Design a protein around this ligand. Structure first.
Ligand code: HEM
Ligand code: HEM
Ligand code: HEM
Ligand code: HEM
Ligand SMILES: [Cl-]
Ligand SMILES: [Cl-]
Lengths: 101, 98
């Protein structure tokens, strides 16, 4: 599997509103092919950006969503953005273990 | 829950060996209190560092481990470490959907 993280620059003070918007749209990507879930991570130390950590079965699955449906879903909305930049960080999962055994 | 990521600088070429070392030691943290697992993420685009993404029930559980047992578990071992730097990135989980 792969991990695609949007590392989003959020002005100081804007975090609560950004979190509210993500919580409201939390199920926006549900059932997209190859999609395995996401987390929104609020920065506490060592990073100032929020990390939007998304998980996919493959890079092709991610690319299909990001280039097609993700973009199309924007028409007929528009409130924001509060973010002032983003960087996509892309990775392959080498290992994934749980906490117990 | 919280996420503590060690973002480790690995020299080009050293990735395979680093991955081998983590795979061998993959269950080193198992059953530590508050520990919920980890992933090792190999960088493909937009980052050059490996991300060691660890999951904890609380910051306190992480701090207990990092300051105590994680350090003590090094004695009586030698490997020449391949990484050339690391940054701990710390976060709180706002939402986690499947
Ligand atoms: C510069 C480019 C972009 C801008 C300005 C933008 C801006 C926005 C804004 C304003 C929203 C609505 C949030 C709100 O206020 O409720 C949104 C939602 C969203 N964005 Fe974008 N975005 C961009 C690119 C992308 C890309 C490239 C992706 C994914 C590959 C993406 C994925 C999403 C998703 C999944 C939502 C939630 C949609 C829903 O609730 O149905 N965005 N974006
Ligand atoms: C999968 C779950 C995702 C959700 C629910 C989501 C939702 C959102 C929302 C609500 C915004 C507007 C933020 C604001 O008010 O400033 C946004 C912005 C944006 N998203 Fe995400 N997104 C997701 C994944 C991604 C991914 C993986 C990417 C990268 C491929 C991405 C790229 C972007 C970009 C480029 C923006 C505009 C940021 C800016 O203007 O500086 N999104 N997304
Ligand atoms: C500059 C400080 C550090 C150095 C030089 C260092 C170096 C190393 C080396 C060489 C190994 C063995 C890898 C192999 O098989 O070759 C190792 C293992 C490990 N390190 Fe460290 N490390 C440092 C700090 C830390 C810290 C702060 C933590 C956690 C908070 C940590 C957590 C671990 C863990 C969980 C292992 C797996 C081994 C086990 O305990 O069974 N290290 N480290
Ligand atoms: C929980 C799973 C973890 C495992 C299995 C693990 C394992 C390892 C291993 C095998 C090394 C040596 C890598 C090499 O050969 O260069 C290492 C190095 C190190 N680890 Fe991790 N680690 C874990 C989590 C952490 C965390 C959360 C931290 C954050 C403090 C950390 C801090 C360090 C540091 C500071 C080094 C030395 C990096 C360098 O010398 O540049 N480890 N760890
Ligand atoms: Cl985002
Ligand atoms: Cl590490």
């Amino acid at each position: 599997p792969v991990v695609k993280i949007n590392a989003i620059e959020v002005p100081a003070g804007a975090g609560p509103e950004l979190e509210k918007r993500f919580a409201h749209r939390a199920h926006a990507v549900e059932n997209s092919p190859g999609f395995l879930g996401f987390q929104l991570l609020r920065p506490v130390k060592g990073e100032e950006r929020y990390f939007v950590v998304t998980h996919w079965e493959s890079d092709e699955a991610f690319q299909a969503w990001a280039n097609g449906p993700a973009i199309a879903a924007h028409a007929g909305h528009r409130a924001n953005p509060v973010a002032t930049g983003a960087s996509l960080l892309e990775f392959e999962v080498v290992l994934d273990v749980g906490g117990t055994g």
